[PDB]
Design a protein around this ligand. Structure first.
Ligand SMILES: Nc1ncnc2c1ncn2[C@@H]1O[C@H](COP(=O)(O)OP(=O)(O)OP(=O)(O)O)[C@@H](O)[C@H]1O
Ligand SMILES: [Mn+2]
Length: 356
C-alpha cells in the first residue's frame, strides 16, 4: 500500500506534481490512482507513481500477446506526486528532484527493453532510491502505448506538466510575515484591502482577536467574491444558482473544470469553512455576518445567497480538498491551508526537477 501523505509540518510545507512525457501507464478500468512509490534507501517516502490524464482504452499490441487479460484496461499519462516536505528543507527538496530525474532515466531503459511490462520493485544502481510497487496490475509503454516498440524516447519533465502546492498556517494568511505568505497574498483574487475594511465595520464590537478576524474575513470574502466572479464568467451551476437565469451560457463543466482552476492561478486546495475553527465562536459569527453584504453589493441576491450557503455548508473551491493538513506544534496542531500553483512561478522553480 502507498503511504498516505504526512499531514503535519513545523512550518510552511511544499509538494510537487510532475507529469511525464514519452510514456503511458495502462491499468484495469477504475483502478486506484496510485500504483507505486519511490523512497530513499533509508526509508523516507519521496513521491507516488500515479495515473493522471486518461489517453483512451488500452489495446495490447498483437506482437506482444502474452495470454493475459487486458480487458477494459485504460491508458493514462504518468504523474509523479511528491510527498510534502518543509519549504526550507534543502535536502528533502533536492532528494525529491534527484529521485524524479533518476526514475525518468530508469523509465527510459524500461521502455527500451521492457516495453508494455509493469515496473519492477528495484533499488537504483547507486543504492540511493527504491521503487515499491503497490499495484502490479499495470504496464508501462512508450509514447501513447499503441505500438509494441518505442521511438527511442528519453523520458522527460517540462514546466507545462509541473505544479507546486504550498501549505501555510491559516492564521498567517494576510500577515505578509514570510516570503511564502507574501507570494500567496500576491494571488490576483486576494484583496488585502478587505482587512482594513473589516476593521472599519467592527469598531463597536469587542472581538477576541481583531487582527485574526480581519485576516479570516479578507481570506474568505476574497474566495467567495472570486467564486461568484467565476460562476458569472464561466456560467457555473453553484448550489441552486442557475447561470441561464441571468442570461449566461455555461462555458465550463463546473468548479473542477481545468480552465476554471487555471483562472484562480493560485488555487485554494482547502475547504474554506475549516478556517472558521481558528477563531472563537463569537469572532467567527462576526466574520460570517459581514461576508453576505460584500457579495450582495457586487452580485445578484441569488448568486450571493447561493455562493454564501455553498461555502457555509462546507463546499469546496475545486473538488476534494486537503483538509487534514496541520502546522506548528505536533502536540497542539494548528490548521494549515493549501494552495496549488497552476503554473510554477519563478520563486518556486528551484523546487522542481529539470531534464535540461
Ligand atoms: N500538507 C501538505 N503541505 C503541502 N503540500 C502538500 C501537503 N499534502 C499534500 N501536498 C501536496 O499537494 C499536492 C496534491 O496532489 P494530488 O495528487 O493529491 O492532487 P491532484 O488530484 O493530483 O490534482 P490534479 O487533478 O491537478 O492532478 C501534491 O503535490 C502533494 O505533495
Ligand atoms: Mn495538481
Amino acid at each position: 500500500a502507498t503511504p498516505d501523505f504526512p499531514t503535519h509540518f513545523p512550518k510552511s510545507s511544499i509538494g510537487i506534481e510532475n507529469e511525464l512525457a514519452g510514456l503511458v501507464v495502462a491499468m484495469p478500468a477504475n483502478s486506484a490512482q496510485k500504483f507505486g512509490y519511490v523512497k530513499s534507501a533509508q526509508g523516507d517516502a519521496l513521491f507516488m507513481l500515479t495515473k493522471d490524464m486518461n489517453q483512451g482504452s488500452y489495446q495490447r499490441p498483437p506482437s506482444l500477446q502474452d495470454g493475459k487479460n487486458y480487458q477494459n484496461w485504460q491508458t493514462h499519462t504518468v504523474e509523479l506526486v511528491s510527498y510534502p516536505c518543509e519549504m526550507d528543507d534543502k535536502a528533502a527538496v533536492e532528494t525529491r528532484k534527484q529521485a524524479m530525474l533518476w526514475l525518468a532515466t530508469h523509465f527510459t531503459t524500461h521502455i527500451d527493453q521492457s516495453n508494455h511490462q509493469p515496473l519492477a520493485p528495484i533499488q537504483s544502481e547507486d543504492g540511493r532510491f527504491v521503487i515499491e510497487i503497490t499495484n502490479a496490475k499495470h504496464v508501462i509503454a512508450a509514447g501513447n502505448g499503441i505500438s509494441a516498440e518505442s521511438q527511442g524516447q528519453t523520458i522527460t519533465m517540462t514546466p507545462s506538466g509541473q505544479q507546486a502546492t504550498v501549505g501555510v498556517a491559516a492564521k498567517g494568511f494576510g500577515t505578509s510575515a514570510t516570503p511564502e505568505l507574501r507570494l500567496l497574498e500576491s494571488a490576483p483574487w486576494y484583496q488585502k484591502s478587505l482587512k482594513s475594511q473589516f476593521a472599519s465595520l467592527t469598531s463597536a464590537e469587542n472581538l477576541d482577536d481583531k487582527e485574526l478576524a480581519a485576516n479570516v474575513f479578507a481570506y474568505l470574502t476574497s474566495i467567495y467574491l472570486k467564486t461568484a466572479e467565476l460562476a458569472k464568467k464561466f456560467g457555473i451551476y453553484i448550489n441552486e444558482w442557475d447561470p441561464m437565469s441571468e442570461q449566461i451560457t455555461p462555458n465550463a463543466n463546473g468548479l473542477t473544470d481545468p480552465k476554471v482552476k487555471n483562472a484562480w492561478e493560485i488555487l485554494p486546495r482547502t475547504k474554506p469553512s475549516k478556517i472558521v475553527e481558528i477563531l472563537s465562536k463569537s469572532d467567527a459569527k462576526a466574520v460570517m455576518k459581514h461576508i453576505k453584504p460584500q457579495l450582495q453589493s457586487r452580485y445578484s441576491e441569488s448568486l450571493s445567497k447561493n455562493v454564501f450557503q455553498y461555502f457555509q455548508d462546507g463546499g469546496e473551491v475545486a473538488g476534494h480538498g486537503i483538509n487534514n493538513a496541520t502546522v506548528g506544534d505536533k502536540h497542539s496542531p494548528e490548521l494549515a491551508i493549501l494552495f496549488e500553483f497552476r503554473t510554477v512561478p519563478n520563486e518556486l522553480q528551484s523546487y522542481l526537477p529539470k531534464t535540461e
